[PDB]
Amino acid sequence: EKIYEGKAKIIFATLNPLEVIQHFKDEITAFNNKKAAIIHEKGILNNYISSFLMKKLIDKGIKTHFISLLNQREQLVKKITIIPIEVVIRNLAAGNFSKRFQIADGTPFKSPIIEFYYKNDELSDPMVSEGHILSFQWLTNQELEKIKILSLKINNILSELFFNVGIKLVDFKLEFGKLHNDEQSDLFLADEISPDTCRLWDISTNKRLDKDRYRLNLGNVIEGYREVAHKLNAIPN
Numbered sequence: 703e704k705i706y707e708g709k710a711k712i713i714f715a716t717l718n719p720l721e722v723i724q725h726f727k728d729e730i731t732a733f734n735n736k737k738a739a740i741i742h743e744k745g746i747l748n749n750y751i752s753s754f755l756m757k758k759l760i761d762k763g764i765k766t767h768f769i770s771l772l773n774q775r776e777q778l779v780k781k782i783t784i785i786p787i788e789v790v791i792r793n794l795a796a797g798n799f800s801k802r803f804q805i806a807d808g809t810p811f812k813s814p815i816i817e818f819y820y821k822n823d824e825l826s827d828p829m830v831s832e833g834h835i836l837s838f839q840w841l842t843n844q845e846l847e848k849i850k851i852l853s854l855k856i857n858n859i860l861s862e863l864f865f866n867v868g869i870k871l872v873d874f875k876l877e878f879g880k881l882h883n884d885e886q887s888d889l890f891l892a893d894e895i896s897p898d899t900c901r902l903w904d905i906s907t908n909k910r911l912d913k914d915r916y917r918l919n920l921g922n923v924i925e926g927y928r929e930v931a932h933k934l935n936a937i938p939n
C-alpha cells in the first residue's frame with residue numbers, strides 16, 4: 703500500500719500506523735523533470751548510504767526518522783509530517799548558486815551558506831526567506847533558529863566523516879518533519895542523505911561522485927554512487 707511516491711522513493715504503509723517503509727527506486731530525474739532515467743542499483747546504494755549516514759547522525763544526537771534497515775531497497779522509518787521546506791547548506795559554490803551569482807563552481811565560502819526553498823513542483827521549489835517561513839507559519843521563530851543550528855551541526859558531522867574518507871561535502875539538502883499529533887514535537891531529519899541530495903567531490907581529483915554525474919551527463923553514474931558507498935563502508939555483509 704503506497705502512501706506517497708516522489709521522484710526517487712515510494713513510502714509504503716505497514717500494519718503499524720506510525721511506521722512506514724521508505725523504498726528507494728532506481729529512477730533519477732533532473733531539471734524539473736525535463737530529464738529522467740533508470741540507473742540500475744542507484745536506489746540500493748542510496749538506501750545503504752542514507753541509513754548509514756542517518757545512524758552516524760543519530761550517534762551524535764541528531765533526531766531522525768530512521769528506525770531500521772530492512773533490505774536492499776527499504777528502511778523502516780517514523781511516520782511524520784514533513785515541513786514543506788528544503789534546507790540547502792553550501793560549503794562551496796555549485797549548481798544554480800554558481801550560475802545565479804556567476805561565481806565559479808568550487809569557490810569556497812568563508813562560512814557555510816544556508817538557503818531555504820518551499821518544496822513545490824508546480825512552482826519549481828521557489829526560494830523563501832525566513833520571514834516568509836514565519837509568516838506562513840511553516841515554523842515558529844524557535845524552530846527556525848533550531849533548524850539552522852541542526853543544519854550546521856549536521857554539516858560539521860557529515861563534512862568530517864566524508865573528509866576522513868577523502869570526499870568533500872560541497873553542499874547538501876535536508877528535509878525535516880514533526881511527530882504526529884505532538885504540537886511540541888522537535889524537528890526530525892527525514893527524506894534521505896545520499897548522492898541524490900549531497901554534492902560530493904573526490905578531494906584529490908575534484909571528480910564529482912553524486913547526481914551531478916547524471917545532470918551533467920558525465921557517465922559512470924552508478925560508479926560514483928558505489929565509490930561513495932565503498933569509501934563509507936555503507937554496504938552490509
Ligand SMILES: [Cl-]
Pocket residue numbers: 796797798799
Ligand atoms: Cl543548486
Ligand SMILES: [Cl-]
Pocket residue numbers: 793857858861
Ligand atoms: Cl564544515
